[PDB]
Design a protein around this ligand. Structure first.
Ligand SMILES: C[C@H](CCC[C@@H](C)[C@H]1CC[C@H]2[C@@H]3CCC4=CC(=O)CC[C@]4(C)[C@H]3CC[C@]12C)C(=O)O
Lengths: 242, 10
């Protein structure tokens, strides 16, 4: 049926940690990049800077994340960052218009065809992989903020990432992963008990695809040309020749 | 030595 008082408290905590993702931009440079009618590779990297830095505030304002060692925090963010962007990408994507629409700034759009400027031999595989992952997440879950937030935390708290060597980090990360996943299970039954089992059973599949798309996205900026004027953060997750 | 690390530490 309905959620317990305890889960609702945990959903408040989750809602607060993600409340920064959709806050208004404060800088005008960032707003101006998002306003452009055409985004080149450098522009896409600056846009990602916005999301990545917000993704980092989210994780820091997360109690569970503060139970991990400092080196384990770096490791989880370094390894899950692209996947979490790709998830956010899915939830603000308009399959009809073929563009991304940031909640933080209406009237602002990013053409899907921005891929046609990325690494030439891989860009087509990525477009398809993005749209495949998108289509593996049903409408009702994709449109549900808390549902994606919980899954965002499930991908974050991945115990098998490079860098997680501390047994304590591994154990606690596995435990969080398991708890978050049980939360989503109960949550999906509270908002639509009709197809909850089917929906929940589908997300693991969709997550295997996410991992695949996000993995071979790291070199998308190779052969895209000069990106030396782009934000530096994003260039720590994406390979560049500049 | 790493923006990501610096954001984390700060
Ligand atoms: C400031 C942002 C703007 C929203 C757009 C953002 C969701 C888009 C812009 C560039 C997109 C990626 C491009 C490279 C890319 C290539 C892939 O193969 C997988 C998916 C990603 C990481 C894209 C995810 C969605 C992003 C970050 C926000 O409001 O969150």
């Amino acid at each position: 049926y309905t959620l317990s008082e305890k889960d609702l408290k945990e959903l408040d905590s989750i809602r607060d940690s993600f409340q920064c993702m959709n806050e208004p931009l404060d800088n005008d440079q960032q707003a101006s990049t998002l306003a452009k009618k055409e985004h080149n590779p450098t522009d896409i990297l600056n846009v990602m800077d916005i999301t990545m830095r917000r993704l980092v505030k989210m994780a820091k304002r997360l109690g569970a994340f503060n139970e991990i060692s400092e080196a384990g925090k770096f490791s989880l963010l370094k390894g899950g960052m692209i996947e979490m962007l790709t998830i956010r990408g899915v939830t603000v994507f308009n399959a009809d218009k073929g563009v991304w629409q940031t909640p933080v700034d209406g009237h602002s759009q990013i053409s899907f065809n921005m891929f046609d400027k990325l690494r030439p031999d891989i860009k087509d595989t990525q477009k398809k992989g993005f749209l495949h992952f998108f289509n593996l997440l049903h409408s009702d879950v994709r449109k549900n903020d808390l549902a994606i937030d919980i899954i965002v935390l499930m991908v974050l708290f991945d115990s098998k990432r490079e860098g997680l060597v501390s047994q304590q980090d591994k154990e606690t990360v596995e435990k969080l992963h398991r708890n978050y996943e049980s939360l989503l299970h109960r949550y999906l039954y509270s908002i639509h008990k009709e197809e909850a089992e089917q929906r929940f059973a589908s997300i693991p599949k969709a997550l295997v695809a996410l991992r695949k798309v996000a993995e071979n996205a790291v070199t998308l900026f190779l052969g895209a040309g000069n990106t030396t004027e782009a934000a530096s953060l994003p260039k720590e997750f994406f390979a560049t020749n500049y | 030595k790493s923006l990501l690390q610096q954001l984390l530490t700060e």
